[PDB]
Amino acid sequence: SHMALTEQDFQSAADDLGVDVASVKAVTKVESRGSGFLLSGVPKILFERHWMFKLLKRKLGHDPEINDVCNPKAGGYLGGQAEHERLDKAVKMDRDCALQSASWGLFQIMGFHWEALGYASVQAFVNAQYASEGSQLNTFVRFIKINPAIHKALKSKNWAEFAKRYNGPDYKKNNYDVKLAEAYQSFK
């Protein structure tokens, strides 16, 4: 109920980035999934078995065993609470790699970014996904900071450049450059 973002959270992030409050609301409206939590109260995730293969391959120094939650071929997605059963299975192979191989919260940030984002450990990154949407928004803010090119675009309010660098070269297919601008106006 209170787990959802508030003006207090939007402003903390805006101040932390050093940008307009409406700019943070804009990207949150488009780049987020509305809620960063499922019904049970656990974070919204999507498990990437090909990242589980890559990360566990780096750790061991050889190919791991290929199953339905560890495979160099991307896909096999279930969805919602079902994704947490895939994570639980992957945790029994290797906890750190599994947790790192899922995208977490509002902005679906991959858990292997934990170190670049400046968290004490993998477990610190996860606890921040369980805490609140405000913490999940802090994670997003941290991702924007470590991408100066994307951070500058947000401050200069380019949208076209921000959408290109964040969403990908094929951003105009979903009208991200436009949606961001129209969203920005809806709050401004």
Numbering used by the authors: -1 to 186
Paper text:
The structure of the monomodular Pseudomonas aeruginosa bacteriophage JG004 lysin Pae87 is presented and investigated in relation to repurposing its function as an antimicrobial agent.
The best apoprotein crystal diffracted only to limited resolution and with somewhat streaky spots, but the best peptidoglycan-bound protein crystal diffracted X-rays to high resolution with cleaner spots. The apo structure could only be refined to relatively high, but not unreasonable, R-factor values, while the peptidoglycan-bound Pae87 structure could be refined to more satisfactory values. The apo Pae87 and Pae87–peptidoglycan models have two and one molecules in the asymmetric unit, respectively. Molecule B of the apo structure is less well ordered than molecule A, as shown by the average temperature factors (68 versus 52 Å2, respectively). There is one amino acid with disallowed Ramachandran values in the apo structure: Gly32 in chain B. This residue has reasonable density and is near Leu76-Gly77 of chain A. Presumably, this contact pushes Gly32 into a somewhat unnatural conformation. The root-mean-square deviations (r.m.s.d.s) between molecules A and B of the apo Pae87 structure and between molecules A or B of the apo structure and molecule A of the Pae87–peptidoglycan structure are 0.5 Å when Cα atoms are superposed. They may mimic the enzymatic substrate or product, and thus their position reinforces the idea that Glu29 and Glu46 possess catalytic activity in Pae87.
